[PDB]
Design a protein around this ligand. Structure first.
Ligand SMILES: Nc1ncnc2c1ncn2[C@@H]1O[C@H](COP(=O)(O)OP(=O)(O)O)[C@@H](O)[C@H]1O
Ligand SMILES: Nc1ncnc2c1ncn2[C@@H]1O[C@H](COP(=O)(O)OP(=O)(O)O)[C@@H](O)[C@H]1O
Ligand SMILES: Nc1ncnc2c1ncn2[C@@H]1O[C@H](COP(=O)(O)OP(=O)(O)O)[C@@H](O)[C@H]1O
Ligand SMILES: [Mg+2]
Ligand SMILES: [Mg+2]
Ligand SMILES: [Mg+2]
Lengths: 370, 375, 370
């Protein structure tokens, strides 16, 4: 089809969408479904019992929030279908699913059934002409004008270190851990509870997420700032009241470098990156250490780069150059890479026909992917 | 199925503890308003050709007020004398009011929030058994206030005669667990004014003299921004003219009586003030709504019409609210009639057909069908 | 070296105090301060503006009642100081506070400032030789005599499921909600208002609490009992009047298992227990299900054990034995645990000494408690 293709990066926290070839996704909205929990009494209340997109943010306190994706794995598929039709709704990207091919972006090392059901949903419920599923990290490396390097993509659900060499991501050297920005927000909720601020409500979890985004940082030395009493910085809640955050500012994101602070049997993010680099043959290791690209929202923490540099230097072999690159467009880098990939005419040969899916099934979509 | 008795113009009744406002849906104002009490002849009937009957309701009870002992069927929004309430509802349908038959028109009834369930059950029983109405909807008062004002979001602070309550509503969604209610209202302020006038040398122990205390409360009373500076000072005693032509000097009782609304502890009742009712109703809701609820406050009921009520309510709310939040208190021009105007607007809609409880639905289910399809 | 340590289980509802080694807390009294609200006119009236303990219960109609604690958190610290002074008065414990080490108890996941201020009060005002802020659930399990299990402590202010493994409370599996006996009594007051019987006064809230303790039960099937015709058991008020309760008798303690009845989007008590069990290690889940220990006052509702067992069986996996233990001393289980702990010689190595607090401050309690 000669019509423009649409890139959809369905992250756990935020879902980016846009017609390919644009330098930026203009239709990014949070990835949750809000349903009203109070009883409607008037004639003329808000019509509809499903609230997705900026409307869910406008009427946030009126709604109970439910996240369809957890750790990059779609738990509720009906809500995912609702969100993906909302992507085509008149509010954002007013178009038809039949007119545009879709470049879906998916987390690496996901279960087989997830890709199978995503293809089934996009081919049956949506009469899409052409679907192609890709990864999030290889695109993020495409965005920054490189073909060799390691991408540390840290999103809302999952964080993974992916070494790519000459475009093709090494499937054997992929490292993945499930602690991400959502787990940091939960840890911040627990710590805020330990300061005398209860946010048990589902809509107040978004306020906790906002507090995480706006007032948090990673200390250079963990024990140094842990022992030192930090100044109490005050944050303004939506109602207008104020909360003193205090040590929870720096204790919360420390989960990323110490998963045992919530009893998760997994490696830290610095350990994940260094293990991803060291899982490859040594001739490429010295190049991978130099070409480190941060990606995803959770890498935007104040002081993330310095602490990651310190930890990687502590772990990596001595006398090896290490350079962390932090692009300003970290949130939208994966979508930018998807747009770049879709702009290439070779993408015309990379998608799967409706006839191809009907004939072969999941075999076609999985042999087409890497 | 089409030209049924259901399709008739419904009758809207807003029965308040102090005043009952009845009319027909579609009218701009309640055409038939009268006090919600029953008068009985106190004296001895000696002349043929006297005032016929022994139950006086409506303007007859008002013009011949001195001739009667007054009994209020409902106190604090709860019906206490059900025979008198039934009599008042029959009078609403009489030749003096609406000139109609109760069996022809559907009914919209208003009720204060958080009332006893038995009150609603008995109201439905009376309006389906004694009055054989086709259908009955029992509405909240705040929803009607928002209907009348044309809005859909707001914290309705309704201070009637027997009940004061704050109901928060957001985008047509009502939060039942943020609704607050106190039983201090205009009746309590009038009783407290009677107590103060006793403390100033005027005894109004007669039941028909309680309405004179009501009139004094309506005319010669106000609210002070600073209660302590008026407490320590002695003001100039205003002069009130009684119905018989004699005069009284009210003085410090003018402002200390309506102060009961913001301080129930003046009568030893340890309940929230009206400002605390409103602010707690806002602050019990979800946080993301609260700011909008602070910018949409709607007043209703006659007890909000005290000279200086808006200013003092704004001052107290601003004292309790978090700093730098836009507080915008609104009020309709006809505060007494707002709830009925909303009831008329709601009963005018075609959606109202799907809201009331049909008579047959009442017969099959009984009290259960009233508890649902209400609020 | 000091006298025998004094155990003080300060709940939100009732404080229970005694000396370590006693079989039961000999000095239990409600945790509120009563102040007279009427006008003293004649000489010979009651002396003192502060009434605490049985003097507050004898003259309950004369006093406005104030609760210092709310959801396990001290809201009024002057009243808390008054109450802890009364614990040491000639009516309770008959001793000076400068001679006995203290074993205070605190609910899990409390604010840090609460523990800090409690230690400051106990070391400055009362000049205790030593202090040890413990946690209620682990003490309750010690009182039962077991070392591994789950303690579902449901008190007046806060309910919480804490799993303990070999005496150590797993901190990343603690579940807590603030819906407890006081919330149930407030809900009962609301329902009695909906039944025509209206109570406003803080002294009449104690009558509502008595109605809860006397005539309230948990139905095994809420929907079955909901639809049936009620019995309307009659309760005799202190003044001699009677009230017919009816449906409010069983819907009031329903709040423990369904917080959404008051608009809270928080887990139920059964959900608290099951989520605490399922948040723990996969190896421990079988032995945690086989070892559940009830505690606190709110677990004494008629039919509480059967209802909780039914809910847990509904939520628990199949082929897993469930054994909810409901010891007779549920009210004093945590105090008995504090007494058992304080009797040991190892307790000497546990407390924060007075000199340690003098030289360190809040950090001494912060390291020693955890
Ligand atoms: N400045 C910031 N500091 C810390 N966290 C941030 C910041 N900006 C965004 N985030 C977090 O990043 C997450 C979104 O990252 P994103 O790359 O969109 O994840 P995904 O790829 O799963 O959509 C959000 O959960 C948000 O909490
Ligand atoms: N101008 C006024 N100033 C003070 N109080 C007033 C005024 N007008 C009416 N009221 C009081 O308001 C009450 C009537 O309020 P209303 O809105 O009828 O409440 P309800 O609907 O519960 O009857 C009366 O008891 C009266 O004392
Ligand atoms: N027999 C009973 N039935 C129901 N509730 C009870 C009973 N006995 C006590 N309670 C409730 O338990 C609460 C006290 O529990 P307790 O274990 O003392 O709490 P805390 O841990 O705060 O001391 C009181 O609020 C009371 O309402
Ligand atoms: Mg991503
Ligand atoms: Mg009214
Ligand atoms: Mg306890």
């Amino acid at each position: 089809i000669a019509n423009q293709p649409v890139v959809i990066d369905n992250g756990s926290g935020v879902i980016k969408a846009g017609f390919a070839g644009d330098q930026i996704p203009k239709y990014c909205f949070p990835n949750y479904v809000g349903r009203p929990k109070h009883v409607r009494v008037m004639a003329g209340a808000l019509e509809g019992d499903i609230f997705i997109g900026p409307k869910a943010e406008e009427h946030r306190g009126l709604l109970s929030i439910r996240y369809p994706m957890e750790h990059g794995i779609v738990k509720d598929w009906n809500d995912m279908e609702r969100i993906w039709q909302y992507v085509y709704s008149k509010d954002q990207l007013q178009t038809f699913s039949e007119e545009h091919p879709v470049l879906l972006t998916e987390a690496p090392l996901n279960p087989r059934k997830n890709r199978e059901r995503a293809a089934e949903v996009f081919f049956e419920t949506f009469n899409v002409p052409a679907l192609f599923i890709s990864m999030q990290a290889v695109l993020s490396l495409y965005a920054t004008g490189r073909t060799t390097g390691v991408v540390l993509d840290s999103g809302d659900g999952v964080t993974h270190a992916v070494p790519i060499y000459e475009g093709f991501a090494m499937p054997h050297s992929i490292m993945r851990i499930d602690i991400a920005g959502r787990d940091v927000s939960r840890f911040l909720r627990l710590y805020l509870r330990k300061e005398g601020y209860d946010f048990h409500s589902s809509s107040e979890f978004e306020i906790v997420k906002a507090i995480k985004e706006r007032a948090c940082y990673l200390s250079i030395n963990p024990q140094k700032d842990e022992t030192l009493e930090t100044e109490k910085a005050q944050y303004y809640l939506p109602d207008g009241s104020t909360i003193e955050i205090g040590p929870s500012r720096f204790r919360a994101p420390e989960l990323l470098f110490r998963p045992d602070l919530i009893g998760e049997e997994s490696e830290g993010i610095h350990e994940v990156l260094v293990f991803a680099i060291q899982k490859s043959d040594m001739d490429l290791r010295r190049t991978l250490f130099s070409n480190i690209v941060l990606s995803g929202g959770s890498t935007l923490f104040k002081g993330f780069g310095d602490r990651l540099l310190s930890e990687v230097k502590k772990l990596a072999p001595k006398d090896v150059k290490i350079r962390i690159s932090a692009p300003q467009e970290r949130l939208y880098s994966t979508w930018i890479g998807g747009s770049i990939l879709a702009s290439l005419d070779t993408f015309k040969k990379m998608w799967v026909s409706k006839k191809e899916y009907e004939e072969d099934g999941a075999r076609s979509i999985h042999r087409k992917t890497f």
